[PDB]
Coordinates of N, CA, C and O in Angstrom, one line a residue:
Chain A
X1 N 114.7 213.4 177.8 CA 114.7 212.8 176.5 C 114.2 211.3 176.6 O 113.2 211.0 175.9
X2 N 114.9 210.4 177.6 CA 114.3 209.2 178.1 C 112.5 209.1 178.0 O 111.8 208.4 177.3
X3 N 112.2 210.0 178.8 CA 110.5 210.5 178.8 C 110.0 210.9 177.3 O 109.0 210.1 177.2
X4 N 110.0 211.5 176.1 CA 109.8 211.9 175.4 C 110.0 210.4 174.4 O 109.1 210.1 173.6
X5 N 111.2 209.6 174.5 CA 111.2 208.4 173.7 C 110.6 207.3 173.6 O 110.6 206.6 172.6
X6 N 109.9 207.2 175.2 CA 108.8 206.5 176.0 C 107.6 206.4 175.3 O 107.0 205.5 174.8
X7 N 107.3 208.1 175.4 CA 106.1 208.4 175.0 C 105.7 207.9 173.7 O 104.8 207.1 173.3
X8 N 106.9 208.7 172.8 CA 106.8 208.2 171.5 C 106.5 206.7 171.0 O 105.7 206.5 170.1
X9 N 107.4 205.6 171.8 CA 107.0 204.8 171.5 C 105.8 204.3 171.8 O 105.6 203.3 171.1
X10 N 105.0 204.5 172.5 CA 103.7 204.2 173.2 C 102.7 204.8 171.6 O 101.9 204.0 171.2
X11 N 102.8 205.8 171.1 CA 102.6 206.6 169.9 C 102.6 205.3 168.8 O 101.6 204.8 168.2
X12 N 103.8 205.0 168.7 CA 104.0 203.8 167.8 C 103.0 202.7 168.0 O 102.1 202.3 167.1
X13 N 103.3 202.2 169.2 CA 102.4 200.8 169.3 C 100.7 200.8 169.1 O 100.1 199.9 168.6
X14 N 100.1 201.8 169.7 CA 98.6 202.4 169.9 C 97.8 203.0 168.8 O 96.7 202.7 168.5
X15 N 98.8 204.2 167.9 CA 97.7 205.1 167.3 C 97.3 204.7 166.3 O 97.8 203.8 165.7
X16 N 96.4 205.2 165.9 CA 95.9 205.0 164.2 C 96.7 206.0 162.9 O 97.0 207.2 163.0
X17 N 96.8 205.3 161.8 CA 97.1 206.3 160.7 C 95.5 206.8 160.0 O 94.8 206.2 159.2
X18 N 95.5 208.3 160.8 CA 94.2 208.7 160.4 C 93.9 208.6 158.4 O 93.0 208.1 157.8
X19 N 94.9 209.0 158.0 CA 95.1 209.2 156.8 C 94.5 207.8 155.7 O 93.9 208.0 154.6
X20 N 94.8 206.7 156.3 CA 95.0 205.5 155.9 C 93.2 205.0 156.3 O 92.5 204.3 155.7
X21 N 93.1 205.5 157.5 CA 91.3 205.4 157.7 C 90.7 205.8 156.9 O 89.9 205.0 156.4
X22 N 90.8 207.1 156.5 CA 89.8 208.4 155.4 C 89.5 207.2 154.2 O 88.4 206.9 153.8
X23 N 90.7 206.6 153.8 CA 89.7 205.7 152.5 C 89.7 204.2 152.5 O 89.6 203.5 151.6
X24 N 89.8 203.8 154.3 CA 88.9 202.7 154.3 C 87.2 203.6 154.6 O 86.2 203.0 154.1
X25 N 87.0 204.4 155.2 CA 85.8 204.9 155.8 C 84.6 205.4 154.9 O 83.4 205.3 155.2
X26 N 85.2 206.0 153.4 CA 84.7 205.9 152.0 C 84.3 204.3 151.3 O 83.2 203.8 150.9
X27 N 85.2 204.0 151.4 CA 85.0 202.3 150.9 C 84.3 201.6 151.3 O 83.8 200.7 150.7
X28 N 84.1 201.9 152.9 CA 83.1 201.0 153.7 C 81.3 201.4 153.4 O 80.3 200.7 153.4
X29 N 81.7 203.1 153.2 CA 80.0 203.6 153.3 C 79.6 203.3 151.8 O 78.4 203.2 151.5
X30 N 80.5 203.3 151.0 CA 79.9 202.5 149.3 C 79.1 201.4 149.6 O 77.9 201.2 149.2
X31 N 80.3 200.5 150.7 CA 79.9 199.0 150.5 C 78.6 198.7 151.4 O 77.8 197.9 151.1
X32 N 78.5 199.7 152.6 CA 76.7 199.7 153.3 C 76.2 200.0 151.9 O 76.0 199.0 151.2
X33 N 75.9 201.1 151.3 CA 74.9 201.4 150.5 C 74.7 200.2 149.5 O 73.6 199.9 149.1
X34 N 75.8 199.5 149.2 CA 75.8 198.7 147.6 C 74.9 197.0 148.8 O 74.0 196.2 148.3
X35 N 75.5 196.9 150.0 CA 74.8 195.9 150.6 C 73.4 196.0 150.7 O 72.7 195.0 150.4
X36 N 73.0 197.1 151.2 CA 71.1 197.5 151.4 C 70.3 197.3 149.8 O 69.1 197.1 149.6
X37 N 71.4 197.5 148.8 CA 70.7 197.2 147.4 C 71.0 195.7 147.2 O 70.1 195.2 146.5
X38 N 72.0 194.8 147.7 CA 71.7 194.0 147.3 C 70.5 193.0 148.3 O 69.8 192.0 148.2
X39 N 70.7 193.7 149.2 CA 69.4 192.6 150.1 C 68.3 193.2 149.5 O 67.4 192.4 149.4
X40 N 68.1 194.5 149.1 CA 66.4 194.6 148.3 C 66.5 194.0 147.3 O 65.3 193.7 146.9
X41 N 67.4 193.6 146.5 CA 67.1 192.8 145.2 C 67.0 191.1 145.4 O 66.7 190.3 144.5
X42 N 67.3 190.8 146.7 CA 67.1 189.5 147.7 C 65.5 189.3 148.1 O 64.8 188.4 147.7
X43 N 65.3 190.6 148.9 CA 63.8 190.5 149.1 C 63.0 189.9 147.8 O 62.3 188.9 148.1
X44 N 62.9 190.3 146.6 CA 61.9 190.3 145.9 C 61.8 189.4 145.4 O 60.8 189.2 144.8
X45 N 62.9 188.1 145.5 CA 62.7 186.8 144.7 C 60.9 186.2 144.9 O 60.5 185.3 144.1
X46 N 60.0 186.7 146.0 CA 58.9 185.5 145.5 C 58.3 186.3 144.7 O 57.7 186.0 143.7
X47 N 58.4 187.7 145.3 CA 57.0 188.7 144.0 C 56.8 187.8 142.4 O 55.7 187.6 141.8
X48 N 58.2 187.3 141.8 CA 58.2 186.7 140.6 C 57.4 185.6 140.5 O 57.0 185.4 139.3
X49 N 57.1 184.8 141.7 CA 56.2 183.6 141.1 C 54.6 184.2 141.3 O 53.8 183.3 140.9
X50 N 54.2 185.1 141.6 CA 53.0 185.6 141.8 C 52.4 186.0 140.5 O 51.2 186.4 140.5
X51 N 53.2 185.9 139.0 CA 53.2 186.3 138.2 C 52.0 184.8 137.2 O 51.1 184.9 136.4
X52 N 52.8 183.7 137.8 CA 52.3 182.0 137.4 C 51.1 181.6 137.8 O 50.5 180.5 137.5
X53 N 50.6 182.9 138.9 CA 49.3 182.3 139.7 C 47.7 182.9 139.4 O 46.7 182.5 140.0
Chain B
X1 N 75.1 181.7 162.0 CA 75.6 181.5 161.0 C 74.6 180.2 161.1 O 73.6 179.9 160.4
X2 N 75.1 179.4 162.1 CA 74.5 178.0 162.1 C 73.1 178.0 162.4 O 72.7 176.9 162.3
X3 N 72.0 178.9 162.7 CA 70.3 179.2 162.9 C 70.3 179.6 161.4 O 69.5 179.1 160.7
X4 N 71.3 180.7 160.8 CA 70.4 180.6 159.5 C 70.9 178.8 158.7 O 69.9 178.4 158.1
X5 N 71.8 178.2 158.6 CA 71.5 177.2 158.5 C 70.8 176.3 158.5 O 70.4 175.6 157.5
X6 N 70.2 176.0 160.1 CA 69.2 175.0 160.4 C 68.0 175.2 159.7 O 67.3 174.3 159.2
X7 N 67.8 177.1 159.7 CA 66.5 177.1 159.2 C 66.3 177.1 157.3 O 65.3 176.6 156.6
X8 N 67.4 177.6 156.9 CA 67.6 176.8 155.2 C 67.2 175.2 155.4 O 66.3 174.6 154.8
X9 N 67.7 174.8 155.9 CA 67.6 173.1 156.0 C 66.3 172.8 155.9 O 65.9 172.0 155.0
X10 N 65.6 173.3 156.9 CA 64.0 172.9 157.1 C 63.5 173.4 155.9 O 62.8 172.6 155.3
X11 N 63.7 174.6 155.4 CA 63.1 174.8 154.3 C 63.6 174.0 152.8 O 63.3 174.2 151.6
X12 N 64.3 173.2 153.2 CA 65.0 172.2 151.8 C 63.8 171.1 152.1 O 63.3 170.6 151.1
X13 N 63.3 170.7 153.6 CA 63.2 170.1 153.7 C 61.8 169.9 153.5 O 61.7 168.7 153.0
X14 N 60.3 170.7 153.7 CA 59.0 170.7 153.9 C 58.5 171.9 152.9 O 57.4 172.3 153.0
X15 N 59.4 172.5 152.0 CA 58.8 174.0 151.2 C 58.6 173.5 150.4 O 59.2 172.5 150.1
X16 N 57.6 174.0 149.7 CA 57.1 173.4 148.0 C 57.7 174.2 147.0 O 58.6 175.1 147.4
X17 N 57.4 174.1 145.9 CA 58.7 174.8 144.9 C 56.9 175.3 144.0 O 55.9 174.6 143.8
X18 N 57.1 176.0 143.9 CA 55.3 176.9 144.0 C 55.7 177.0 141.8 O 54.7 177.1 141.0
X19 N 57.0 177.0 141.3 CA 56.5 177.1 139.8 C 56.2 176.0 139.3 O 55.7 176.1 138.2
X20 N 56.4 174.9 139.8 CA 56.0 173.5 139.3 C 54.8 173.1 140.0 O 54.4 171.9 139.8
X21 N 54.1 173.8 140.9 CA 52.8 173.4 141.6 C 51.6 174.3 140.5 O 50.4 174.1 140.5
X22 N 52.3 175.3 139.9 CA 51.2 176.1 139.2 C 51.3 175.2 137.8 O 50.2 175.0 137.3
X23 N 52.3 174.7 137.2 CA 52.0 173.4 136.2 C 51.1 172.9 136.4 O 50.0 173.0 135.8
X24 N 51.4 171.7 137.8 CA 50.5 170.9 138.1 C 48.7 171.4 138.4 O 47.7 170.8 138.1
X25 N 48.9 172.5 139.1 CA 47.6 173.2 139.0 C 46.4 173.2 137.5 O 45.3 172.6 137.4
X26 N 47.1 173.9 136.6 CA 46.4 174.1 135.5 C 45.9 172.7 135.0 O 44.7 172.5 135.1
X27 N 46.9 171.4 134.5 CA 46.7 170.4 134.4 C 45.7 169.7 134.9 O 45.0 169.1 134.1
X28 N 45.3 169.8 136.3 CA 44.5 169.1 137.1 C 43.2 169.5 136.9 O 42.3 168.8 137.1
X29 N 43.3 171.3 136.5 CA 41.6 172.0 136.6 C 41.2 171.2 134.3 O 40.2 170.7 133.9
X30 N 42.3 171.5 133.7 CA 41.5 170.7 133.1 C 41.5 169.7 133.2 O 40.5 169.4 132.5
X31 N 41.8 168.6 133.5 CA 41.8 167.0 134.0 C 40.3 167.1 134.8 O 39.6 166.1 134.5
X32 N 39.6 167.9 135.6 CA 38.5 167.8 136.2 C 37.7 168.6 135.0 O 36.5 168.9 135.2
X33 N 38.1 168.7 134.2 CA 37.0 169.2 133.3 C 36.7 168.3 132.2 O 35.7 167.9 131.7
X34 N 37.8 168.0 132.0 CA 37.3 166.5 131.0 C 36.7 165.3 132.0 O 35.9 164.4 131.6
X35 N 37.0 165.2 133.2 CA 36.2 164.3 133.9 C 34.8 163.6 133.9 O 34.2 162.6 133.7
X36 N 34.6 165.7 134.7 CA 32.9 166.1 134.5 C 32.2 165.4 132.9 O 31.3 164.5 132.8
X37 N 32.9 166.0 131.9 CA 32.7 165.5 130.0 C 32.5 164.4 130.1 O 31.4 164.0 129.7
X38 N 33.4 163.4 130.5 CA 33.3 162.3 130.5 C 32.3 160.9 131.4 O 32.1 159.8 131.0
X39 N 31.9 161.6 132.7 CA 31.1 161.5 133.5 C 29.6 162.0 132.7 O 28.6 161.3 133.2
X40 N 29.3 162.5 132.1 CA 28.3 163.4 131.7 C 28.3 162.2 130.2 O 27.1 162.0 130.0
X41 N 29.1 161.4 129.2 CA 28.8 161.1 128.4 C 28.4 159.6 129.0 O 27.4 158.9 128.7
X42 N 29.3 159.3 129.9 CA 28.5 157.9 130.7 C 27.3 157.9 131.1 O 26.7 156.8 131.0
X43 N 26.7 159.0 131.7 CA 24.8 158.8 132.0 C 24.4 158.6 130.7 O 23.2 158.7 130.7
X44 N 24.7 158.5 130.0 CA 23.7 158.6 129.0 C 23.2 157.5 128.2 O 22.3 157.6 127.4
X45 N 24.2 156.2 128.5 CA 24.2 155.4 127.7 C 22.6 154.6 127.9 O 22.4 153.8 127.1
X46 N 21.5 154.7 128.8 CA 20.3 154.2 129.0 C 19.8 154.7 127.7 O 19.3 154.0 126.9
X47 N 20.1 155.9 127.5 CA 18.8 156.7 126.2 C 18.9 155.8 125.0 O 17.9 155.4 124.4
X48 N 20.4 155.5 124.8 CA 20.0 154.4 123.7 C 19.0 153.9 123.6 O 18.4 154.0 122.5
X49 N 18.3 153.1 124.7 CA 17.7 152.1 124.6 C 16.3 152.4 124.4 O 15.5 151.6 123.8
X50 N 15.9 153.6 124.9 CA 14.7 153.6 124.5 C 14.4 153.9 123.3 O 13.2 154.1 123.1
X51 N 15.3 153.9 122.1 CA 14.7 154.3 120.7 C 14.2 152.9 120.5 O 13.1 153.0 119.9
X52 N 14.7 151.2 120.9 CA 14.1 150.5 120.5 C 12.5 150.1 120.9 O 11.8 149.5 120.2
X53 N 12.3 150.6 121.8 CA 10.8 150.2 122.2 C 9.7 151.9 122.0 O 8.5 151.8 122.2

């Protein structure tokens, strides 16, 4: 039992709550896709003065 | 963090600001065109002269 409460606690200090991952791991791949759109909408600031030339 | 800093800096520091250079552009091409006009009505002032003789 000693051995088994050991373990457990080793369980406690180390593991992950997979559960609690699944919708940071959603939220993170929104926030890549929504970041790649905002750096293309970054890129394009000089195309607009090419319009004055 | 602090390289993209330095290099924002330099660019505060030596970049031209390109929508107020295409103002000054236009301005200037007619400014050399009334020049020429005006350059062009100054030769002329000899011809007066020969209507008197």
């Amino acid at each position: 039992k000693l051995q088994d409460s050991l373990d457990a606690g080793v369980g406690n200090l180390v593991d992950a709550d997979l559960a609690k991952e699944s919708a940071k791991l959603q939220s993170l791949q929104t926030k890549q896709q929504l970041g790649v759109q905002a750096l293309s909408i970054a890129n394009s600031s000089s195309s607009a003065i090419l319009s004055l030339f």
